[PDB]
Design a protein around this ligand. Structure first.
Ligand SMILES: [Mg+2]
Ligand SMILES: [Mg+2]
Ligand SMILES: [Mg+2]
Ligand SMILES: [Mg+2]
Ligand SMILES: [Mg+2]
Ligand SMILES: [Mg+2]
Ligand SMILES: [Mg+2]
Ligand SMILES: [Mg+2]
Ligand SMILES: [Mg+2]
Ligand SMILES: [Mg+2]
Ligand SMILES: [Mg+2]
Ligand SMILES: [Mg+2]
Ligand SMILES: [Mg+2]
Ligand SMILES: [Mg+2]
Ligand SMILES: [Mg+2]
Ligand SMILES: [Mg+2]
Ligand SMILES: [Mg+2]
Ligand SMILES: [Mg+2]
Ligand SMILES: [Mg+2]
Ligand SMILES: [Mg+2]
Ligand SMILES: [Mg+2]
Ligand SMILES: [Mg+2]
Ligand SMILES: [Mg+2]
Ligand SMILES: [Mg+2]
Ligand SMILES: [Mg+2]
Ligand SMILES: [Mg+2]
Ligand SMILES: [Mg+2]
Ligand SMILES: [Mg+2]
Ligand SMILES: [Mg+2]
Ligand SMILES: [Mg+2]
Ligand SMILES: [Mg+2]
Ligand SMILES: [Mg+2]
Ligand SMILES: [Mg+2]
Ligand SMILES: [Mg+2]
Ligand SMILES: [Mg+2]
Ligand SMILES: [Mg+2]
Ligand SMILES: [Mg+2]
Ligand SMILES: [Mg+2]
Ligand SMILES: [Mg+2]
Ligand SMILES: [Mg+2]
Ligand SMILES: [Mg+2]
Ligand SMILES: [Mg+2]
Ligand SMILES: [Mg+2]
Ligand SMILES: [Mg+2]
Ligand SMILES: [Mg+2]
Ligand SMILES: [Mg+2]
Ligand SMILES: [Mg+2]
Ligand SMILES: [Mg+2]
Ligand SMILES: [Mg+2]
Lengths: 111, 66, 141, 77, 45, 181
RNA sequence: UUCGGAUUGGGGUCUGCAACCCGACCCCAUGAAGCCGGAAUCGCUAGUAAUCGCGGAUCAGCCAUGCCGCGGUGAAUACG
RNA sequence: CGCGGGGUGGAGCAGCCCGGUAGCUCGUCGGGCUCAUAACCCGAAGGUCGUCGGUUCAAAUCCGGCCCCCGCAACCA
RNA sequence: GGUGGGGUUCCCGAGCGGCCAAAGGGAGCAGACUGUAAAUCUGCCCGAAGGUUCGAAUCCUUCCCCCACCACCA
RNA sequence: GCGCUGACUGGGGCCUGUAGAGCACUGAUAGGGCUAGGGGGCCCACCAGCCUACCAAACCCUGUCAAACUCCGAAGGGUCC
RNA sequence: GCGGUCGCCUCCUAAAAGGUAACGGAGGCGCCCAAAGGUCCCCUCAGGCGGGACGGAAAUCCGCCGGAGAGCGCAAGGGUAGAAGGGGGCCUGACUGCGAGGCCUGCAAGCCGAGCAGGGGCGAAAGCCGGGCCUAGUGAACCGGUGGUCCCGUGUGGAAGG
RNA sequence: AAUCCCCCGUGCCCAUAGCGGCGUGGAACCACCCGUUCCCAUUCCGAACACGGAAGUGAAACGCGCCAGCGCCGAUGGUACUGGGCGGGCGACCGCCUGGGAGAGUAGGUCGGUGCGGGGGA
């Protein structure tokens, strides 16, 4: 089996984003944690990071998520950053990712 | 499982030439069965009833003395 | 008469006879060979006039390898010429043969026996030839 | 007679601006049949797969291997 | 089958293409008029 | 419904005898049952969907799941069959419901097959899953014989995490599959 | 189909020197074609036709459903 | 060479347009009537569609080639 | 494009405001007669939607096709 | 009228699929081996069934061919600075 | 003369930009789709081998291997699974008013097109949407039909006719 | 802070990073995993997608290493061809000068490299 549905759908949803050419807010949700970077492509460079790992929190991951959401706005908005594009990667926009997103408002907007 | 248009699958009671199969777990509880094997009728714990092996044998025997 | 079964296009352009080259050329199958000195279109009916010259000399004996093949369609206009209307009418087939190529190439026969056969075989051909033996130079592969 | 005899018009396809040419927004850059030059930075691609400068700029070519060939317009014309 | 789409009144609109017997029905679909904005647009003649 | 005698019988009888025999180093490495997929090729019913829907009603009754419908991949003319017509039914089942179904299959169904000197042991497909076809559908307990319009069989596919054949055999052996030896 | 008993499996009885080819019969299993027969065609005018059984001859036994006889019950219809 | 038409059970012909299940007459075979044959009557069998590629899900059928066939043409010179 | 006729049980075909399984013909089936084949004879079996009345195969609107005709074509 | 922009030349980028060559694709194709299918010669007529000094799939060794083949690909040519 | 041909698309000829001829080699078009269209969300082929009742070279099912040889309505080419392919849901942007700037080009045509405005669709959003993977599916003007609208209406209002 | 090593993201080069075989990793990260109440789900199936988890395992997956059987990359020399200049042959075609110079093949090479950000080590 070459190149699984995971890595297709991943590319498929990424490639579209990378076109509009905004800052990318990438989201990696694992079985335990949820992490988010804000990346500038063509400089190939991460700007602002946030995670349930580095903020050492737990208790009900959809609620954890919204928190690393408000956490990213805060840090990021501080550098001038506004207007990004919301990655969502392999994930359906739903649940934990929907929540990091819909807690990633107050800065870093339109989602 | 999708909700609606789906069979119930409730704990049941199956009978046979033997006693009850307690396990069951199927729609339509309390079902009757022709012959269950694994209680050892039917070739399991083989009884081999009304066996023969007499095809060569019969003309080897009664024809022996006669 | 050699001829490809199942062609992809009947009627292909003539193209040139340039540049003696491109494989064949080293005697891979046998003890002796006929090598092309000049370029030509060599005709199926020419190849079989060579084949038979040789099997006749082996009295059906020996081994004969050929190694050129007539895949190039040869057209002609009926007699009745007049230029136009179309192209028309494949007669034979040819193999294109440039210099240094081995055609034919016998084996399993005495030297002076094969060398006599190849010489005969050569007269049936339109170009000049060379008879050859086999070599260190024909390597191993 | 011959049952042959046709051909269609030349479609005058190919590349219309080469690397480091100064283009303008809207200039078309490549005329092409399939997707054989994919649009890069600041390069649109029309329904006939045709690539055009999005901005005034200069043109650069990029060969990305299995990713294909890419035409970008590099802004600040 | 050449196709011509009326709407309600003032009758100016836009026209179309149907090469089929489907839909054989009243053949009606939503569109933008030049005066009012985006009404029902049925098919006539 | 998490009890299911055969399920238990796998853990407290079969898993152990398995490690004892092949000597598995890891907990996971010992063969698990995933996925009994049941399938009916029904193309006997082509232009009549009425015949199909009665047969899917049938499976659900024995499986406890409403089956899928499979549709003609390509048009193949020699026997009817244009593309996209309903061919037959297919239901995947796992995880409990595979268990509860396999349980019935071993104690009730197979005993009720005419003759049945046991299951052919060459159907292991060599990467270690097993497949079997059935002639009629009333060998299941849920079928009353007065509900049958016509007898249609099926294909049962059983998938093992056993990398090999000989292993996959053992698993099913020890589960009580009556092989013809 | 409790119609019909063809085929076939197995098991036996008897005659006979002997039943493989080729016997008759009994029992168990098996139960086929066949739902009244195209063009056509046969018999019969009364105790006849239909239907039912029984006997002889030949013969060890029998392929007899044949033949030659026996009685049992017993129609229809002849304008011409 | 040119152009148009064709090639299908034993014979002679449909079917090809318009893709999906090859028909008609005669002939042949088995029976009936007759002393017998023929006529007549009741049944039956028989063709892969010149050939090779191709198109399609499917080709006697649509396309291409080759092969025989019939017709027309070959004038100014 | 226009005008006039249509549309009925398998085919044709008449078809009326008081119901018209709906004349009739032939086809098919089963009987009678039979050298063959028939001829003769007896039985068997409302284009569409809507609408007007108590009743619609009948009257109207509409829609779909057929036949017919006339006319036009930048 | 403009007036250094011209042909040609130097350097630099980009573009291309020819000459050559190649056989990875599409086809063609010689010799061998190994092998489905098969002609069959036939062992039976029940699945069987051994041999190929004929066809011939695939597959492997060896060896080639192509305007409408290309895993490759010059010299040159075009265009902008 | 007879025969063939005559516009459009694809490939080769065509000499590695473009263009390029012959009664040079080969094929196709004169349509089609209310989903075969927009969008969002998923999904990934053909083929080979093993397995599996009726199932056979191939109906459907399961395993593994298979980077694209499948599919993309139709000819070929280019393209293409990191989708243009397959499925589903909501939908009609197969909108109106325009159109920087260019491809092409003797003319006239043919072509691509960002962007703004109106009112929308799908989407959480970024966004996409002015038919369809693309390249054929076509016809200047004149004369007339039909629908609409404001415009003109031969002294004036109408009307005729534009 | 830095340098290093390990992991998780996420880019770039676009096979010298690939297939295969072996080995190795669970503290932490990651996965599988525990469940299906809830959000949300599968033309049937929590397989997938989704949520709540944290008992177990690194078996699968992945990460890291090693091996050149395959795959991939590949000189140097030498030819083919050729821009420009000249000859030769009835021809098909050949040769010389000057500049450029493949393809295959031979030697070899390779079981990746690297950026930004995290988490962890020192
Ligand atoms: Mg040579
Ligand atoms: Mg000579
Ligand atoms: Mg062209
Ligand atoms: Mg397995
Ligand atoms: Mg006998
Ligand atoms: Mg009866
Ligand atoms: Mg009789
Ligand atoms: Mg009398
Ligand atoms: Mg009687
Ligand atoms: Mg008697
Ligand atoms: Mg006769
Ligand atoms: Mg006679
Ligand atoms: Mg065919
Ligand atoms: Mg004259
Ligand atoms: Mg008669
Ligand atoms: Mg100057
Ligand atoms: Mg200049
Ligand atoms: Mg220069
Ligand atoms: Mg060449
Ligand atoms: Mg090749
Ligand atoms: Mg070439
Ligand atoms: Mg190279
Ligand atoms: Mg240059
Ligand atoms: Mg003429
Ligand atoms: Mg060119
Ligand atoms: Mg050129
Ligand atoms: Mg044509
Ligand atoms: Mg497959
Ligand atoms: Mg298979
Ligand atoms: Mg393709
Ligand atoms: Mg859709
Ligand atoms: Mg313009
Ligand atoms: Mg808008
Ligand atoms: Mg005029
Ligand atoms: Mg006008
Ligand atoms: Mg105005
Ligand atoms: Mg006025
Ligand atoms: Mg006046
Ligand atoms: Mg006036
Ligand atoms: Mg752990
Ligand atoms: Mg541990
Ligand atoms: Mg629930
Ligand atoms: Mg589902
Ligand atoms: Mg592991
Ligand atoms: Mg090399
Ligand atoms: Mg060199
Ligand atoms: Mg030179
Ligand atoms: Mg090299
Ligand atoms: Mg990295």
């Amino acid at each position: 089996a070459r190149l699984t549905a995971y890595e297709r759908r991943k590319f498929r949803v990424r490639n579209r984003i990378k076109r509009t050419g905004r800052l990318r807010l990438s989201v990696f949700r694992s079985l335990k944690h949820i992490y988010a970077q804000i990346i500038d492509d063509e400089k190939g460079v991460t700007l602002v990071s946030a995670s349930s790992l580095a903020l050492k929190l737990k208790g009900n991951k959809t609620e954890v998520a919204r928190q690393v959401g408000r956490a990213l706005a805060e840090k990021a908005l501080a550098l001038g950053i506004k207007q990004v594009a919301f990655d969502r990667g392999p994930y359906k926009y739903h649940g934990r990712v929907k929540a990091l997103a819909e807690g990633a408002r107050e800065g870093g907007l339109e989602f | 499982m999708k909700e609606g248009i789906h069979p119930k699958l409730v704990p049941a009671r199956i009978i046979c030439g033997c006693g009850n199969v307690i396990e069951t777990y199927s729609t339509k509880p309390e079902i009757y069965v022709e012959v269950c094997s694994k209680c050892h009728p039917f070739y399991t714990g083989q009884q081999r009833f009304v066996d023969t092996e007499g095809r060569v044998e019969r003309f080897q025997r009664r024809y022996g003395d006669s | 008469m050699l001829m490809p079964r199942r062609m992809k296009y009947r009627k292909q352009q003539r193209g040139r006879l340039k540049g003696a080259t491109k494989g064949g050329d080293y005697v891979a199958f046998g003890d002796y060979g006929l090598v092309a000195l000049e370029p030509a279109w060599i005709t199926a009916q020419q190849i079989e006039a060579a084949r038979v010259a040789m099997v006749r000399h082996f009295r059906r004996g020996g081994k004969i390898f050929i190694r050129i093949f007539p895949d190039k369609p040869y057209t002609k206009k009926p007699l009745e010429v007049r230029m136009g209307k179309g192209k028309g009418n494949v007669e034979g087939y040819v193999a294109v043969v440039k210099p240094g190529r081995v055609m034919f190439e016998v084996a399993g026969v005495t030297e002076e026996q094969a060398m006599e056969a190849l010489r005969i075989a050569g007269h049936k051909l339109p170009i000049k030839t060379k008879i050859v033996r086999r070599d260190a130079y024909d390597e191993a592969q | 007679s011959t049952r042959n005899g046709r051909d269609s018009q030349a479609k005058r396809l190919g590349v219309k601006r080469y690397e480091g040419q100064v283009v303008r927004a809207g200039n078309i850059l490549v005329r092409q049949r399939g997707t054989r030059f994919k649009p890069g930075k600041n390069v649109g691609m029309g329904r006939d797969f045709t690539l055009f400068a999005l901005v005034d700029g200069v043109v650069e070519f990029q060969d990305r291997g299995r990713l294909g060939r890419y035409v970008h317009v590099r802004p600040l014309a | 089958l050449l196709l011509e789409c009326t709407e309600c009144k003032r009758r100016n609109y836009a026209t179309e293409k149907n090469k089929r017997n489907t839909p054989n029905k009243l053949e009606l679909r939503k569109y933008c008029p030049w005066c009012r904005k985006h009404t029902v647009h049925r098919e006539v003649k | 419904p998490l009890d299911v005698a055969l399920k238990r019988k796998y853990y407290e009888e079969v898993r152990p005898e398995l490690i004892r025999r092949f000597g598995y180093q890891n907990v996971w490495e010992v063969p698990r049952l995933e996925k009994v997929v049941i399938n009916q090729g029904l193309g006997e019913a082509k232009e009549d969907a009425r015949i199909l829907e009665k047969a899917a009603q049938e499976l659900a009754l024995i499986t406890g799941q409403k089956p899928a419908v499979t549709r003609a991949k390509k048009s193949i003319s020699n026997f009817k069959l244009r593309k996209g017509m309903p061919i037959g039914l297919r239901v995947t089942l796992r995880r409990d419901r595979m268990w509860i179904f396999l349980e019935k299959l071993l104690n009730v169904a197979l005993p009720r097959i005419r003759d049945f000197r046991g299951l052919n042991p060459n159907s292991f497909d060599g990467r270690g899953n097993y497949n079997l076809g059935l002639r009629e559908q009333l060998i299941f307990p849920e079928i009353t014989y007065d509900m049958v319009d016509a007898l249609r069989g099926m294909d049962i596919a059983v998938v093992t995490t056993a990398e090999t054949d000989e292993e996959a055999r053992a698993l099913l052996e020890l589960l009580g599959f009556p092989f013809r030896k």
